[PDB]
Ligand binder design. Sequence first.
Ligand SMILES: Nc1ncnc2c1ncn2[C@@H]1O[C@H](COP(=O)(O)OP(=O)(O)OP(=O)(O)O)[C@@H](O)[C@H]1O
Length: 301
Amino acid sequence: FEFDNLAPMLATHGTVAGLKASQWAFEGMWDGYRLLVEADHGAVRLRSRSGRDVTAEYPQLRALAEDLADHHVVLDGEAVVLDSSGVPSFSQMQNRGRDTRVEFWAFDLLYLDGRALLGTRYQDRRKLLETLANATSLTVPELLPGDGAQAFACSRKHGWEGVIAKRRDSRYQPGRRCASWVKDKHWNTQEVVIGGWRAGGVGSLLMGIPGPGGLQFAGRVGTGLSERELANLKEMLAPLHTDESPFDVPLPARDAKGITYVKPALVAEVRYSEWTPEGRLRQSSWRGLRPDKKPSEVVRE
Ligand SMILES: Nc1ncnc2c1ncn2[C@@H]1O[C@H](COP(=O)(O)OP(=O)(O)OP(=O)(O)O)[C@@H](O)[C@H]1O
């Protein structure tokens, strides 16, 4: 076992309603950044999903192990920023500033005080993690009770993004996406390319799907407004400003009012209920930017 070779295990997109509690545990899906956390001698070290050393990017998490000073542990979990409803928000994480509070929500334990746990079944790793957290300041969200449909319904009532089901008998497989973990969201989600923006900072974004002849306008998506989402989103949009509309049809007057067009370089993810027959996203909401996705990969899902 070696923390410096570790990469997170990944979940397969699927449906959790139908899965039974006898074989499956159910966790809330937390929007944030995935972190592997090594705590030793009261000091913390961090690895991102890409294996990069990101310890310096999270000074908020330095105190994580000050309560664990006698332990040597490796944890898996999510760094999160909570919205005003208490729910992890990806956009608030992406737009965090120097005063923004960041938490680490742990959901796995991969090494504990001389015992490497990759081959230990999830159900047993969880009990060890819960015991560790009950005695310290580590934050370990509880499992959702019931079978998959009940767990999904509970997640929805809380306003959480979805559920991750994890097989109770499953080992931890670093760096692999596995059938033993199933991820399921309440909302349909669609990748879109940003073609322009309107002020309230940045009040809203004009979305499109790449096609022959340019972006096919998919509607305006409100940002929700952090008044820092906007200063930061403006920052990412500023190098892309252009006088040339990227859309395949010049935008209608109401959608073009006050618009700054951008080169169609940035992918974002939005939630939606259904497509309209004209190609617009109904009940859209902003999840956040997807900086590693390429516009050429964006297709109507
Ligand atoms: N409780 C949890 N246990 C494990 N992973 C979680 C949990 N909560 C959130 N995640 C992570 O959040 C993401 C939720 O799935 P989603 O489809 O939004 O991911 P993504 O970033 O689009 O794709 P990927 O699965 O490649 O990360 C996954 O990365 C998942 O591993």
